[PDB]
Design a protein around this nucleic acid. Structure first.
Lengths: 70, 67, 71, 71, 70, 68
RNA sequence: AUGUAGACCCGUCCUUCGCCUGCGUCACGGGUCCUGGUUAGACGCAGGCGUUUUCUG
């Protein structure tokens, strides 16, 4: 089969369940918060404020607890 | 679904002071004067063009009003 | 349109080969490839973490793998 | 504000008015000179010599004076 | 002569075919070495002790040990 | 309506066999002559030909002045 | 003898975001070539819309 898209479902499940995540940027910096919303190119990450994070600056998104899409 | 643009227009319109962190760790500050698919014009003492491909994060001083 | 990237990654995933993923900033991740898409890889160790391919330099499998018996 | 509206008009105004600029690269290096000409993908920067700077390596272009321009 | 533009794939294919030992320098300064086993639009498979997959977007230069004739 | 100078500039350097320095994004300086080049790569000749990805280059600077 | 043709040559008349559409402009003298060869592009003006960089410029 087509091989199913895994970036938008994964992020959406984190967003919907308000899972706390750590976002590591390419320069080593670690952001934390909850995924508020996201778009093809950015992610809105909410902690004390909403900050807009470019996907092209992200290395990894690692959730506090396991999340499943199917 | 576009929110980069709704999120960046709102900061511009409201003249919200922002911090822009670059991929190399540098922190820029100012107000978003105007901003496009490939750059953002950031105004402090002078207007300086900033390439979006060099930005990691845009973080506003004061929360901006979104849905 | 053609790729050896998808064929190579899928074999690692299917066989549950332990891999090391080196990022562009020098950081080394390890785990098994759980799934992947055009733009990311899900890497499983203690938890599943999502790794952007544009942050990866190399994927190096822990144990060598088959040619796929290519003709 | 839609499409590439600010990417090339701003550069042209610098180029035409021979405004001295500073170009900061993504690795922290600071170049200075006058924009001589620009492609979609590069900028020619003139000081003692003309050097070709890839845009993908640039973080910011900051002019010496706010352009004596519409803005 | 005449041509289609690309020399990136002919150059790589010649190295692969001739089993030329190469050095691949990554954008972070790391030096990889081996032989080019195969490659696609986006990656190169580099063989030493094991076959590892190298993203082209991480590569700065490919420099062959000895002459390649295109 | 604009112009393309990236591929005229290179191609003048390659034709005139001008010495050049290519600075990479990581600070490394390569030197040589442009031999062949492409949408995404430049072939740089010194003791051997090496293939340099454009996406790794910050600047190309000629030893001697030339026209765009 | 060389064209009710064409492609080049010579001479005379301060580039810049893309794209769709509509309107116009790309001329005049002379020269070479027993001539793979093209159906498009460029500039002017009007109107409209705009991939938001997530795997090589």
């Amino acid at each position: 089969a087509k091989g199913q898209s895994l970036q938008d479902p994964f992020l959406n499940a984190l967003r919907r369940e308000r899972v706390p995540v750590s976002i590591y940027l390419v320069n080593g910096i670690k952001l934390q918060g909850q995924i508020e919303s996201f778009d093809q190119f950015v992610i809105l990450l909410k902690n004390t404020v909403s900050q807009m994070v470019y996907k092209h600056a992200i290395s990894t998104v690692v959730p506090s607890r396991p999340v499943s899409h199917h």
